[PDB]
């Protein structure tokens, strides 16, 4: 009969009761869990049955207590972080946590020695300070999360808490081997080797097991339980093998493992991510509840028999002293912390000083000191002071941190958030009134009690002259920035932006909204796609270094790796039969060099002819095998930075297009309109130029991230198609679940894609043109009459005023399109110049000047004309070319007229892509607009409408007023019309 | 140093490796986990370090092994049931599991005594049979789940497995106290008391703790961790208290607790539902992996030192015999099982015989026999035979159950499922082609490697004359049944149907598609809303039984409940001071009866004046206190049955309306069309009449379920409005998450609603009319000139041909509307008759005849005319009345023209509710349709269109061809127009 089940389940129900009954009160549930543990402990001191239960559970071995409870708490603290904000402010967190922890430990140690009546030496006092300085704020982290601004302060506090806990348990372990378990003597070399081993091989072992865990998690599909199991078992084996089998600091290993697993969260399937977050939260809640209950039981059973009034006075003065010590540490590190890019203000310094809640980590360290001291009074004093100051910090610091956050002014709700929430509440109320008015006129629910329904459905508000020229200029500036933030959020919710690209764009917009007259600039956005660092230099020097028999030699080296460990008995079996006869004399000298890299192999073979030779040969083979894996790793890091830079640039370009489309309704002054459009177009042109040059710098990695984004977009739209087939009732839940399972497996395989897809040849770029597509005869015709031309920097390719003489399929480099439509654009690889010129036979619109070395395909005008005259199938080349250019000319019109209905540009292009050009030669050059046509766009030519009421002669969306188009026929027009037919 | 962490995490990694590498192979991962446990055991027997690890973990105490691993497996088995399909087929599952288990146990016991060379008596042989007959199929259950038809066979197998495992551990525990731990001697009375205690107080204790857990889970909002903590702690404490503190069968308690918690899933939040399902799946996977690893270790360490060739021969012959025994048990219970409504076929009998996979439950029972036997050989033989039969059943039965499901014909994909999946694959393929054609013409992704993208995005197919008059009649019948199934799914997906109502309607349509010429009938659907049973009789007898001082007397009885337990020392403190002086002489005889229910209290007081008296008084007060709680429980059960019946009624009515709307396109023959519409209208009228009578039978419970449905609908549309504020970017993620948190809290509070809302007075029904709404002066006007009339059965309220004389707000009863529009309809409480007649001054359309006793309000025509003439505010009574009747005439037109775009009737009504009647007296009696009007519906009057091209003179949706309406004015028309303006 395991009474551990009784104590664990009773602690679970006591924690559930403490959580449920104490929601409205500001007092935490952990201190009342400590109180309930105190009553259970004195009941156990009276009653012998409860004595048996809490004796076999609460009087637990210290090593099993650490090994069970510390990995869960440390991994949840590392896994609950926003790791990107943690890594952006790694410097402040790191220097504050480590240096403030060590100086607070020394200050608490000398405070204990010069204050406490016990004759503690410096080692026990430093153990006391190591327990003392470990802070676990969770209520403060949640409070700073949900009160809006100063969001980075919460991440600073949480990361500082994680590193404070980790290195506090590290220095606690160092001084606990200094005091309790050994008292050995060693030299300075062994001491510095032990310090090196702990402080370095902690994070290195954690990084190694985290890399193995991430690699194994990335290759697992369609079973969640394996992923959850690997996460839990990897955490527990990391801590156990590091702490026991090695002398590695196991706490830092779990810190690094949790930070890496939270960093590479894309290797896990999203439902498993949600499960893992809630599961580790539940595990840490169980660990905290068990630790607090057992701390209360043992502190009222064993540690409360030696306390005195002097001990209580020491506890009060110690609490005041450690609060003052943390405040002085923060104040004396304030200049160096302010020299980093997120300088702490005095309000944030006060919040970090007062937000130092002690918790279960320090309680567990006091538990293992109390159990390690035995019958000595030092563990009793340790446990009493730690438990009392956890009580004091919890009560006073939680209640006054709510009060003090209210007092400082960091708890106020901002005016745009108030307006947005009030508008959302207004929209909710009109929707509820509309639903009530519909349901009152329902033939089945006509007699529901409507006062009870109206009382149950009430979503209340949770928050309850040249001078005016500058005023409208500023108001238009904030309105532009707000509209850009709405555009960024609209991009994110439609599966376009990444999460980090959203975050960087909205922080840049919120910073730009705070100064006097600046917008979201380009220079502060350049740092997202700044690839420059050690990574491109590594990539180029390793590519310069490189530039089935080899697999057999690598397999032989992998097999001969183990005799190195064997040699480092029949003289070790004749030295493994002379190392397999020198590995069959280096496989007959690599088959006589297959009948500098080979020179090193020849030198190694000469050394073998003349154990260290085996080590040199094995290390040279390992280097020659592991160099391309290092190339793949560097390519992956550049891919990871390049994806974030590309997504930030794409989000800025698309958002500037949205805010330029919706600028006509919002601002009303013409001068402010023209100025804001000028800054918008300047930023858009500069960002598209930088993205083109960044594409040119690394071609293969850019092709890889573009392919990855294309596969993600296609699989997202397949997911929406599966959802809309489910939602229309055509597919049941099980079959749609099977198809969603297939697309999720495909996305997980897309995550582990090659990070450097090699760039296609110009023939492969010529084959994959949109208006070419299939039709292999026409592809062969175009490839037979193609013409690859090479242009250097600065050479003008096309003039603005000359006749349309051919196409330009850009297969290399970046061009610039100066045009007096002033139309400026930077086209890039894969774009075709002059399709409208070669279709409409009109003299050209823009001149094209190279910005780098540009290779293009010159498909001539005569070849294209006889290509139109040659291929006239049901999909004709004329129809495909006019369809491509018709989509291109009709996207800004439907974008302009119906961006007010909340449609993005991508949804506009998907709505346009279902359309078709109509055959005007069929229906006697007149087309009627019945109810089946949704959006009808004229592309080229002149039109007369209805009973010839007026004429339309422009690229324009034909309005609802017009019923019938009649089409005039002359030369040099041959009009086109694009329709969309009713979903 | 806990080596349990090493063995648990190592078993977790080995189970993860065994799951990952063995996905494609049909051999299960549990048998290769047993193999890995065998290798770990032999290297444990060689190496002393692995000997230490597997010694301190695998050689575990039996009681703690049961108490840890059995609750998790039993609770996941009970929680993974579809409990509704389990409850529909409870009879076959219960008699098959119980009686087949006991007769298979006796057959295996006499098989062991008459076969095995060991001199086993009947108690040890019945222990062997109890271990042998416990089956745990999971692979067969999943295989039957994904393979289409015979869905009920998987639920039969799963429920039979759950009850088989539970009662098998029960009889195993009975015979394990018969053999091992005691050998005591007792009488027949104590034996039947022990049997009664186990077999009755198991499920009763499980029901009690399950009811407490469901009650505590229902009152918990806005935390998940509390809910999973309560679930896990309730499971473990139920098993521990039942097995240890009582002699209750703890396995049956966890079975009943899991079945009730899975039955009352609506008390848990849906995210916590998903987390709890995946969490208990993960826990049982960990338990299975640990059990199989430790079984392999102890089998190859201890159980394989006594094996012989005779033991192996006994193992194969025992496996053949127990397969034959299970088949014989199934075949000899086949007639009684066939007499129940889901009769087993020979194919299902063969699948159930061959699907008997032994597993971790029997492995754990053999583990505790082996550890309980000690150095005796009986535990070694037990563990060898059990582990060998688990290996044999796993390998042979899993591979041959796959090939046997293929052979028998139950794995064949049906033709409608094949057509739907192939059509869905075609929609995915055109959507992918459309997205590719869009992305090829993107200015940023123009150079992705498109062959790799097209290769990565391929969602392939997983499944690779009077005679012809009857042919089209049958084809139209299956086409209606398919379209009705589509409508039922569409109703479920928009948050209208319940899950069980979906399942019942779909199963009834699938049954109706199988016979010759039957449709989804009304009589087989009548059993969904058959309230009749013991519950209405209980409700009426308790309501006949009933028909702050009482709280003080109840508190006094609750305080004096404890001296009953004290009396059942100073003579028990003078008998608790004469039972607090007879509870202050029954509180001064209830304050002298406040200066039969009181007669019993007077008799109890006279008895107390003259311990058993105290017991009688306390039991009488307990009866009088918990009578109304019993009526609330009965009301809750009737509400739960009534909600399912009502939801099936609404689903059938709405789906028949959809399939009557879409019958014009589908069915092309006119005679088939008219006949099929006649059957649809007959079913619709019969179901609406039965629902009206069912509303009349229980008024308050019907008002409660209508209020609950109304609150659910309003909160669902508020959730959609929050989501559409999320997608439009007006609200960020945290603010919308706060609003979604509020609406989820409101739905959880809606779940614990009062089960019988009392019916409102007729004044309250008169106040909550849709065209009245607010306007308290108008409410007072109508109430002052209302007239309540009472009509009995059969009396005609309204003639067909007489003049329109007033309104009829039905506040009681059910009416019938015979009309020659043949229009037949049953109106109920809350509907208004004659609004169109009193607005347009026409003679009436239908005659109204009472079907029960009907109370109505006569708002006369003259009073309504002066109400029109009196109130002429900006919302006028004329505008509100015409808006209500305009919605009522305009929903079938908008539903008819635009149901082909996949809009339900509710979305049509919400689209119509945004509209407004235009003031036709303003714009010179002519209205121009610009692009801002979406749908324009004429309501009354005659109309001329555009340049007077034609005339429209009916209720009709004005088409896209019309540009301008000009309106003629004359007496007795005064036309109305309803518009909807652009979202």
Nearest Cα to Cα of residue A834 among A853, A847, A852: A847
- The answer on whether B665 is annotated among ligand-binding residues is no
| DSSP states of A46-80 | H-HHHHHHHHHHHS--HHHHHHHHHHHHHHHHHHS
Residue A665: count of CB within 10 angstroms of its CB:
9
| DSSP states of B231-272 | HHHHHHHHHHIIIIIS---HHHHHHHHHHHHHHTGGGS-HHH
> Could you tell me the CA-to-CA distances from A680 to A88, A648, A656, A886 in Å, in that order?
28, 16, 6, 26
* Contact (CB<8Å) A714/B449: no
CB contact at 8 A, A280 and A76:
yes
* Contact (CB<8Å) B441/A770: yes
Pairing of strands B823-825, A956-957: unpaired
CB contact at 8 A, B877 and B867:
yes
Task: Give the residue from chain B lying closest to A904, CA to CA.
Answer: B728
Quote the DSSP letter at residue B757: P
Pairing of strands A943-945, B846-850: unpaired
Least CB-CB distance to A432: which of B485, B714, B947?
A: B714
Nearest Cα to Cα of residue B489 among A721, A736, A731, A734: A731
Task: Give the residue from chain A lying closest to B449, CA to CA.
Answer: A707
> For residue B810, what are the β-bridge partners?
B856
- The answer on whether B835 is annotated among ligand-binding residues is yes
In angstroms, the CA B288 to CA B297 distance is: 14
Q: Best residue in B241, B447, B709, B884 to probe A by mutation, most A CBs within 10 Å?
A: B447
* Contact (CB<8Å) B743/A459: yes
Nearest Cα to Cα of residue B86 among B528, B681, B500, B694: B500
Element spanning B493, H or E: helix B466-493
Pairing of strands B796-798, A916-917: unpaired
Nearest Cα to Cα of residue B745 among B224, B276, B274, B265: B224
CB contact at 8 A, B136 and B357:
yes
Nearest Cα to Cα of residue B252 among B103, B421, B95, B77: B77
Minimal C-alpha gap between A325 and chain B (Å): 36
* Contact (CB<8Å) A730/B487: no
* A808-812 β-sheet, strand order: A788-791, A854-857, A808-812, A832-833
User: Phi first, then psi: what are they for B809, rounded to 5°?
Assistant: -80, 110
Which pair of tokens denotes residue B521? 């009938």
> For residue A952, what are the β-bridge partners?
A943
Nearest Cα to Cα of residue A480 among A517, A525, A526, A527: A517
Task: Specify whether the backbone of A954 is left (phi greater than 0), alpha (psi in -120 to 50) or beta.
Answer: beta
In angstroms, the CA A812 to CA B447 distance is: 10
Element spanning B420, H or E: helix B415-439
With H, G, I as helix, E, B as strand and everything else as coil, classify residue B833: strand
Minimal C-alpha gap between A316 and chain B (Å): 34
Residue B581: count of CB within 10 angstroms of its CB:
9
CB contact at 8 A, B771 and B881:
yes
User: Phi first, then psi: what are they for A85, rounded to 5°?
Assistant: -70, -30
> Could you tell me the CA-to-CA distances from A791 to A769, B120, B188 in Å, in that order?
21, 96, 107
| DSSP states of A569-609 | -HHHHHHHHHHHHHHHHHHHHHHHHH--HHHHHHHHHHHHH
- The answer on whether B129 is annotated among ligand-binding residues is no
In angstroms, the CA B364 to CA B66 distance is: 7
Task: Specify whether the backbone of B473 is left (phi greater than 0), alpha (psi in -120 to 50) or beta.
Answer: alpha
> Could you tell me the CA-to-CA distances from B568 to A662, B615, B623, B656 in Å, in that order?
83, 10, 20, 65
* Contact (CB<8Å) B457/A20: no
Task: Give the residue from chain A lying closest to B10, CA to CA.
Answer: A233
Q: Is the dihedral of CA A489, A493, A495, A498 positive or negative?
A: positive
Nearest Cα to Cα of residue B579 among B622, B618, B624: B618
Residues of A in contact with B710 (CB under 8 A): 439, 445, 448, 450, 453
Class of residue A917 by CB neighbours under 10 A (exposed 0-12, middle 13-18, buried 19+): middle
Nearest Cα to Cα of residue B243 among B412, B368, B57: B368
Q: Using H for helix, E for strand and C for coil, what is the string for B431-457?
A: HHHHHHHHHCCCCCCCCCCHHHHHHHC
Q: Which residues contact B127 (CB under 8 A, 6 or more apart)?
A: B172, B175, B176, B178, B179, B369, B382
* Contact (CB<8Å) A229/B285: yes
* Contact (CB<8Å) B768/A451: yes
CA B786 to chain centre: 44
Residues of B in contact with A278 (CB under 8 A): 224-225, 271, 275
Minimal C-alpha gap between B906 and chain A (Å): 9
CB contact at 8 A, B437 and A884:
no
In angstroms, the CA A427 to CA B725 distance is: 9
Task: Give the residue from chain B lying closest to A145, CA to CA.
Answer: B734
CB contact at 8 A, B928 and B964:
yes
- The answer on whether B845 is annotated among ligand-binding residues is yes
* Contact (CB<8Å) B439/A494: no
Q: Which residues contact B374 (CB under 8 A, 6 or more apart)?
A: none
Pairing of strands A916-917, A976-980: antiparallel
Element spanning A833, H or E: strand A832-833
In angstroms, the CA A884 to CA A834 distance is: 12
**Burial track A866-887 (b if 16+ CB lie within 10 A, e otherwise):** ebeeebeeeeebbbbbbbbbbb
Which pair of tokens denotes residue A488? 């960024």
User: Phi first, then psi: what are they for B849, rounded to 5°?
Assistant: -125, 135
Pairing of strands B956-958, B935-940: antiparallel
Q: Is the dihedral of CA A176, A177, A182, A186 positive or negative?
A: negative
Q: Look at chain B and count its residues.
A: 983
Residues of A in contact with B419 (CB under 8 A): none
Least CB-CB distance to A282: which of B9, B20, B225?
A: B225
> For residue A169, what are the β-bridge partners?
none
In angstroms, the CA B122 to CA B152 distance is: 37
In angstroms, the CA A644 to CA A528 distance is: 7
CB contact at 8 A, B913 and B887:
yes
Q: Best residue in A421, A449, A459, A751 to probe B by mutation, most B CBs within 10 Å?
A: A449
* Contact (CB<8Å) B930/A487: no
Q: Is the dihedral of CA B23, B24, B28, B33 positive or negative?
A: negative
CB contact at 8 A, B53 and B3:
yes
In angstroms, the CA B799 to CA B837 distance is: 13
Q: Which residue has the tokens 């690893």?
A: B293
* Contact (CB<8Å) A887/B441: yes
Nearest Cα to Cα of residue B638 among B501, B525, B751, B539: B539
Q: Which residue has the tokens 């919308």?
A: B736
CB pairs under 8 A between A and B: 406
Nearest Cα to Cα of residue B946 among B961, B968, B933, B924: B961
Half-sphere exposure of residue A587, counting CA atoms within 13 Å on the CB side? 17
Residues of B in contact with A213 (CB under 8 A): none
Quote the DSSP letter at residue A22: T
Angle CA(A178)–CA(A183)–CA(A187) in degrees, nearest 5? 85
In angstroms, the CA A530 to CA A401 distance is: 40
- The answer on whether A479 is annotated among ligand-binding residues is no
Q: Which residues contact B809 (CB under 8 A, 6 or more apart)?
A: B765, B766, B769, B830, B831, B832, B856, B857, B859
Residue A597: count of CB within 10 angstroms of its CB:
11
In angstroms, the CA A745 to CA A748 distance is: 5
Inter-axis angle of helices A122-132 and A377-392, nearest 10: 30
In angstroms, the CA B493 to CA B503 distance is: 13
Nearest Cα to Cα of residue B718 among A431, A659, A346: A431
Residues of A in contact with B424 (CB under 8 A): 722, 725, 730-731, 735-736, 739
* A815-819 β-sheet, strand order: A796-798, A846-850, A815-819, A823-825
Cα dihedral A170/A174/A180/A184 (nearest 10): 160
Which pair of tokens denotes residue A800? 């603005």
Minimal C-alpha gap between B826 and chain A (Å): 10
| DSSP states of A418-472 | HHHHHHHHHHHHHHHHHHHHHHTT-SSSTTS-HHHHHHH-----TT--HHHHHHH
Quote the DSSP letter at residue A860: B
Minimal C-alpha gap between A339 and chain B (Å): 32
Class of residue B368 by CB neighbours under 10 A (exposed 0-12, middle 13-18, buried 19+): buried
Element spanning B782, H or E: helix B776-784
CB contact at 8 A, A174 and A126:
no
Class of residue B225 by CB neighbours under 10 A (exposed 0-12, middle 13-18, buried 19+): buried
Element spanning B723, H or E: helix B699-727
With H, G, I as helix, E, B as strand and everything else as coil, classify residue B363: helix
With H, G, I as helix, E, B as strand and everything else as coil, classify residue A936: strand
CB contact at 8 A, A453 and A624:
no
Inter-axis angle of helices A466-493 and B699-727, nearest 10: 110
CB contact at 8 A, A274 and B272:
no
* Contact (CB<8Å) B431/A721: yes
- The answer on whether A844 is annotated among ligand-binding residues is yes
CB contact at 8 A, A30 and A290:
no
Residues of B in contact with A929 (CB under 8 A): 960
Task: Give the residue from chain A lying closest to B273, CA to CA.
Answer: A275
**Burial track B840-857 (b if 16+ CB lie within 10 A, e otherwise):** beeebbbbbbbbeebbbb
Pairing of strands B976-980, B935-940: antiparallel
* Contact (CB<8Å) A445/B710: yes
> Could you tell me the CA-to-CA distances from A975 to A917, A918, A969, A980 in Å, in that order?
11, 10, 8, 17
Task: Specify whether the backbone of A841 is left (phi greater than 0), alpha (psi in -120 to 50) or beta.
Answer: left
Nearest Cα to Cα of residue A812 among A835, A836, A831, A833: A831
């Amino acid at each position: 009969a395991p009474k551990v089940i009784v104590f664990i389940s009773g602690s679970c129900l006591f924690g559930a009761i403490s959580r449920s009954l104490f929601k409205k009160l500001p007092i935490p549930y952990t201190v009342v869990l400590l109180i309930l543990g105190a009553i259970l402990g004195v009941v156990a001191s009276n009653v012998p049955l409860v004595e048996e239960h809490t004796r076999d559970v609460a009087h637990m071995d210290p090593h099993v207590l650490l090994q069970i409870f510390l990995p869960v708490l440390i991994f949840e603290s590392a896994f609950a972080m926003d790791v990107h904000t943690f890594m952006r402010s790694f410097s402040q967190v790191c220097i504050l946590a480590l240096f403030g922890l060590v100086v607070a430990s020394v200050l608490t140690a000398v405070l204990a020695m010069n204050l406490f009546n016990y004759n503690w030496n410096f080692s026990e006092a430093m153990m006391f300070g190591a327990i003392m300085s470990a802070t676990d704020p969770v209520a403060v982290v949640a409070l700073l999360k949900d009160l809006g601004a100063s969001k980075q302060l919460g991440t600073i506090i949480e990361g500082e808490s994680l590193l404070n806990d980790g290195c506090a348990i590290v220095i606690f372990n160092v001084f606990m081997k200094m005091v309790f378990f050994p008292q050995l003597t060693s030299t300075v070399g062994q001491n510095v080797l032990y310090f090196l081993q702990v402080a370095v091989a902690g994070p290195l072992w954690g990084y190694a097991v985290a890399k193995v865990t991430v690699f194994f998690l990335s290759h697992i599909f369609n079973d969640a339980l394996v992923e959850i199991t690997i996460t839990l078992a990897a955490t527990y084996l990391t801590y156990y093998i590091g702490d026991i089998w090695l002398e590695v600091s196991g706490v830092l290993a779990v810190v690094v493992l949790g930070l890496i697993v939270n960093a590479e969260k894309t290797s896990i399937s999203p439902e498993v991510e949600v499960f893992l977050h809630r599961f580790w939260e539940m595990l840490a809640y169980l660990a905290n509840t068990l630790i607090f209950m057992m701390v209360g039981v043992v502190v009222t059973q064993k540690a409360l028999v030696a306390v005195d009034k002097m001990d209580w006075f020491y506890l009060i003065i110690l609490y005041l002293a450690i609060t003052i010590i943390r405040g002085m540490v923060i104040s004396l590190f304030s200049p160096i912390l302010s020299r980093i890019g997120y300088g702490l203000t005095w309000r944030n310094a006060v919040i970090m000083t007062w937000g130092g809640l002690r918790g279960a980590v320090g309680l567990a360290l006091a538990l293992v000191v109390e159990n390690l001291a035995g019958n000595d009074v030092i563990g009793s004093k340790f446990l009493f002071h730690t438990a009392g100051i956890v009580v004091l910090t919890l009560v006073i610091n939680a209640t006054t941190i709510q009060t003090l956050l209210r007092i400082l002014g960091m708890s106020d709700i901002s005016i745009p958030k108030r307006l947005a929430m009030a508008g959302a509440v207004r929209r909710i109320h009109e929707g509820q009134n509309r639903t009530l008015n519909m349901l009152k006129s329902d033939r089945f629910l006509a007699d529901a009690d409507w006062d009870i329904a109206t009382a149950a459905c009430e979503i209340s508000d949770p928050y309850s002259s040249p001078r005016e020229f500058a005023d409208m200029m500023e108001e238009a500036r904030l309105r532009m920035l707000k509209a850009e933030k709405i555009s960024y959020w609209k991009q994110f919710e439609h599966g376009m932006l990444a999460r980090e690209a959203l975050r960087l764009l909205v922080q840049h917009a919120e910073v730009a909204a705070d100064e006097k007259d600046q917008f979201i600039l380009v220079d502060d956005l350049k740092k997202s796609w700044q690839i420059k660092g050690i990574y491109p230099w590594l990539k180029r020097k390793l590519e310069d270094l490189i530039s089935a028999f080899e697999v057999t030699i690598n397999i032989a080296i992998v097999l001969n790796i183990v005799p190195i460990i064997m040699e480092f008995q029949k003289i070790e079996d004749a030295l493994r039969i002379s190392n397999y006869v020198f590995f069959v004399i280096y496989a007959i000298e690599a088959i006589v060099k297959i009948l500098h890299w080979n020179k090193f192999d020849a030198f190694i073979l000469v050394v073998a002819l003349v154990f260290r030779l085996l080590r040199g040969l094995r290390m040279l083979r390992l280097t020659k095998a592991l160099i391309p894996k290092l190339i793949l790793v560097v390519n992956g890091k550049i891919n990871n930075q390049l994806s974030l830079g590309y997504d930030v640039g794409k989000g800025y370009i698309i958002g500037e297009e949205e805010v330029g489309k919706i600028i006509d309704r919002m601002v009303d002054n013409k001068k402010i309109l023209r100025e804001l459009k000028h800054i918008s177009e300047t930023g858009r042109l500069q960002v598209v130029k930088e993205l083109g040059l960044l594409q040119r710098e690394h071609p293969g990695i850019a092709v890889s991230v573009k392919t990855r984004q294309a596969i993600r977009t296609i699989l997202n739209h397949s997911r929406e198609t599966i959802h809309e087939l489910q939602g229309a009732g055509l597919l049941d839940e099980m079959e749609a679940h099977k198809l969603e399972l297939t697309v999720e497996i495909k996305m997980k395989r897309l995550m582990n894609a090659p990070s450097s897809i090699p760039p296609p040849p110009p023939e492969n770029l010529l084959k994959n043109v949109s208006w070419l597509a299939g039709d292999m005869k026409l592809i062969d015709f175009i490839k037979a009459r193609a013409s690859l031309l090479h242009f250097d920097y600065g050479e003008v390719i096309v003039r603005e005023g000359d006749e349309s003489d051919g196409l330009f399929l850009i297969v290399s480099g970046l061009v610039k399109l100066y045009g007096k439509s002033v139309f400026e654009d930077y086209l890039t690889v894969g774009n075709v110049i002059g399709e409208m010129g070669v279709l409409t036979k009109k003299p050209r619109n823009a001149t094209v000047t190279c910005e780098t070395t540009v290779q293009v395909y010159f498909i001539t005008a005569e070849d294209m004309n006889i290509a139109i005259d040659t291929f006239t199938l049901y999909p004709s080349l004329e129809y495909r070319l006019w369809r491509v250019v018709a989509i291109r000319i009709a996207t800004p019109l439907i974008m302009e007229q119906m961006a007010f209905q909340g449609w993005t540009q991508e949804k506009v292009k998907l709505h346009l892509e279902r359309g078709y050009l109509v055959d005007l030669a069929e229906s006697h050059f007149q087309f009627n607009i019945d109810a089946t046509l949704e959006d009808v766009i004229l592309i080229n030519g002149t039109a007369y409408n209805a009973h010839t009421r007026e004429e339309i002669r422009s690229p324009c969306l034909i309005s609802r007023t017009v019923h019938k188009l009649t089409f005039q026929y002359t030369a040099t027009e041959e009009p086109r019309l694009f329709v969309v037919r009713n979903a």
